Design an enzyme around this catalytic site. Structure first.
Site, PDB file in Angstrom:
ATOM      1  N   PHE A  29     -67.628  53.992 -19.489  1.00  0.00           N
ATOM      2  CA  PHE A  29     -68.405  55.017 -20.180  1.00  0.00           C
ATOM      3  C   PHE A  29     -68.578  54.650 -21.656  1.00  0.00           C
ATOM      4  O   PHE A  29     -69.632  54.740 -22.268  1.00  0.00           O
ATOM      5  CB  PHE A  29     -67.570  56.324 -20.041  1.00  0.00           C
ATOM      6  CG  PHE A  29     -68.277  57.551 -20.599  1.00  0.00           C
ATOM      7  CD1 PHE A  29     -68.162  57.875 -21.951  1.00  0.00           C
ATOM      8  CD2 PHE A  29     -68.988  58.430 -19.776  1.00  0.00           C
ATOM      9  CE1 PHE A  29     -68.805  59.008 -22.459  1.00  0.00           C
ATOM     10  CE2 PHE A  29     -69.598  59.593 -20.250  1.00  0.00           C
ATOM     11  CZ  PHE A  29     -69.511  59.865 -21.616  1.00  0.00           C
TER      12      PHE A  29
ATOM     13  N   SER B 209     -58.514  40.347 -18.112  1.00  0.00           N
ATOM     14  CA  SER B 209     -57.794  41.587 -17.880  1.00  0.00           C
ATOM     15  C   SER B 209     -58.088  42.125 -16.489  1.00  0.00           C
ATOM     16  O   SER B 209     -57.222  42.672 -15.804  1.00  0.00           O
ATOM     17  CB  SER B 209     -58.211  42.628 -18.907  1.00  0.00           C
ATOM     18  OG  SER B 209     -57.974  42.121 -20.206  1.00  0.00           O
TER      19      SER B 209
ATOM     20  N   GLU C 179     -63.930  61.890 -26.134  1.00  0.00           N
ATOM     21  CA  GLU C 179     -65.227  61.925 -26.756  1.00  0.00           C
ATOM     22  C   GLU C 179     -65.491  63.138 -27.615  1.00  0.00           C
ATOM     23  O   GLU C 179     -66.333  63.104 -28.512  1.00  0.00           O
ATOM     24  CB  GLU C 179     -66.324  61.799 -25.681  1.00  0.00           C
ATOM     25  CG  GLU C 179     -66.211  60.436 -24.984  1.00  0.00           C
ATOM     26  CD  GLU C 179     -66.732  59.285 -25.800  1.00  0.00           C
ATOM     27  OE1 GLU C 179     -67.265  59.417 -26.881  1.00  0.00           O
ATOM     28  OE2 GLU C 179     -66.458  58.132 -25.282  1.00  0.00           O
TER      29      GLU C 179
ATOM     30  N   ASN D 258     -53.112  41.845 -22.650  1.00  0.00           N
ATOM     31  CA  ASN D 258     -54.419  41.226 -22.768  1.00  0.00           C
ATOM     32  C   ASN D 258     -55.515  42.201 -23.199  1.00  0.00           C
ATOM     33  O   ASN D 258     -56.407  41.872 -23.959  1.00  0.00           O
ATOM     34  CB  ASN D 258     -54.847  40.637 -21.443  1.00  0.00           C
ATOM     35  CG  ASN D 258     -56.021  39.695 -21.440  1.00  0.00           C
ATOM     36  OD1 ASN D 258     -57.146  40.118 -21.109  1.00  0.00           O
ATOM     37  ND2 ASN D 258     -55.796  38.511 -21.977  1.00  0.00           N
TER      38      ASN D 258
ATOM     39  N   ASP E 160     -71.848  58.146 -33.906  1.00  0.00           N
ATOM     40  CA  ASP E 160     -70.608  57.766 -33.279  1.00  0.00           C
ATOM     41  C   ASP E 160     -69.814  56.807 -34.168  1.00  0.00           C
ATOM     42  O   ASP E 160     -70.164  56.512 -35.308  1.00  0.00           O
ATOM     43  CB  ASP E 160     -70.850  57.268 -31.854  1.00  0.00           C
ATOM     44  CG  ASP E 160     -71.388  55.859 -31.813  1.00  0.00           C
ATOM     45  OD1 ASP E 160     -71.581  55.163 -32.769  1.00  0.00           O
ATOM     46  OD2 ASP E 160     -71.586  55.411 -30.626  1.00  0.00           O
TER      47      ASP E 160
ATOM     48  N   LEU F 157     -74.775  58.664 -25.846  1.00  0.00           N
ATOM     49  CA  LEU F 157     -75.506  57.820 -26.770  1.00  0.00           C
ATOM     50  C   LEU F 157     -76.988  58.059 -26.670  1.00  0.00           C
ATOM     51  O   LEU F 157     -77.561  58.075 -25.604  1.00  0.00           O
ATOM     52  CB  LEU F 157     -75.238  56.327 -26.566  1.00  0.00           C
ATOM     53  CG  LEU F 157     -76.212  55.504 -27.401  1.00  0.00           C
ATOM     54  CD1 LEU F 157     -75.738  55.446 -28.848  1.00  0.00           C
ATOM     55  CD2 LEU F 157     -76.320  54.093 -26.847  1.00  0.00           C
TER      56      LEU F 157
END
Ligand SMILES: [Cl-]
Ligand SMILES: [Cl-]
Length: 162
Positions: free
Chosen positions: A104, A117, A11, A132, A20, A32
């Site tokens: 996250f 998945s 990040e 996948n 972002d 965010l």
């Protein structure tokens, strides 16, 4: 290596409001703020999150506080999620961190949707799950990050972060 260090690498750290990868107002370590196009809305949300009139700028300690809260919420969202919990419980320490990372970034709901998945991870079919997970917008929009995460799930090691 751990979840904090891992996400800090993925990040980054920014002390001023920024946009972002999707164009949304964020701050600190991928926190965010809002999906709205308004910078004022962003600044309002920031002040509210921090508990002070920031003027779109925070300190490193503030960023870190937001970060801890955010890691905590992600774990918690996983634990409370009927689709997520069982997967997380079935995994080793390394791979759990990979799941937290996805949570996250994508949100509980977003991750809960990778049904196929999820199922592959649960069965410990690594190579298959890796293939996948790659068939997704997530991989297509943020390929380097996704590759790191996917490698973590495939190998159960931190190699992609070293
Ligand atoms: Cl918050
Ligand atoms: Cl990327």
């Amino acid at each position: 290596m751990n979840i904090f260090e891992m996400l800090r690498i993925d990040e980054g750290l920014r002390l001023k409001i920024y946009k972002d990868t999707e164009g949304y107002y964020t701050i600190g370590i991928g926190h965010l703020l809002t999906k709205s196009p308004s910078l004022n809305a962003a600044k309002s949300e920031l002040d509210k999150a921090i508990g002070r009139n920031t003027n779109g700028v925070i300190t490193k300690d503030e960023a870190e506080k937001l970060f801890n809260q955010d890691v905590d919420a992600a774990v918690r969202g996983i634990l409370r999620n009927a689709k997520l919990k069982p997967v997380y419980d079935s995994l080793d320490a390394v791979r759990r961190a990979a799941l937290i990372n996805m949570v996250f970034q994508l949100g509980e709901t977003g991750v809960a949707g990778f049904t196929n998945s999820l199922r592959m991870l649960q069965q410990k079919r690594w190579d298959e799950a890796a293939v996948n997970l790659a068939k997704s917008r997530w991989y297509n929009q943020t390929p380097n990050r996704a590759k790191r995460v996917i490698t973590t799930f495939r190998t159960g090691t931190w190699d992609a972060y070293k």
